[PDB]
Amino acid sequence: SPEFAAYKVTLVTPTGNVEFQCPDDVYILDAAEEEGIDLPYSCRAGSCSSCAGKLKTGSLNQDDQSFLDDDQIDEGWVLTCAAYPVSDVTIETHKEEEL
Numbered sequence: 001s002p003e004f005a006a007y008k009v010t011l012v013t014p015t016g017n018v019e020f021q022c023p024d025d026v027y028i029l030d031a032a033e034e035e036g037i038d039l040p041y042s043c044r045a046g047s048c049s050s051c052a053g054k055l056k057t058g059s060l061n062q063d064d065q066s067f068l069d070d071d072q073i074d075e076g077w078v079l080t081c082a083a084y085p086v087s088d089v090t091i092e093t094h095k096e097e098e099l
């Protein structure tokens with residue numbers, strides 16, 4: 001394993017696909033915001049539905065999330081404020097209305 005790593009995040013947002021590198025120790029939301037992408041949120045603490053997305057491709061660490069149940073994680077749900085990439089990932093954002 002590397003001392004330092006980042007992963008390519010592809011977000012499929014309502015206004016288009018956007019891509020950026022996300023450090024492996026920065027949450028998806030935080031890294032998107034630093035690149036000027038506006039994503040939904042409210043609690044920023046892993047305990048609500050606001051920042052929900054769907055993982056389409058790759059792997060995440062969501063140890064820091066709590067609101068999604070184990071079946072929802074198995075089904076690909078993501079709380080973007082509380083998720084770290086562990087590989088390159090593609091995530092569809094703005095999926096709250098779907099819960």
Ligand code: FES
Pocket residue numbers: 040041042043044045046047048049050051052067079080081082
């Ligand atoms: S903004 Fe509440 S869980 Fe992410």
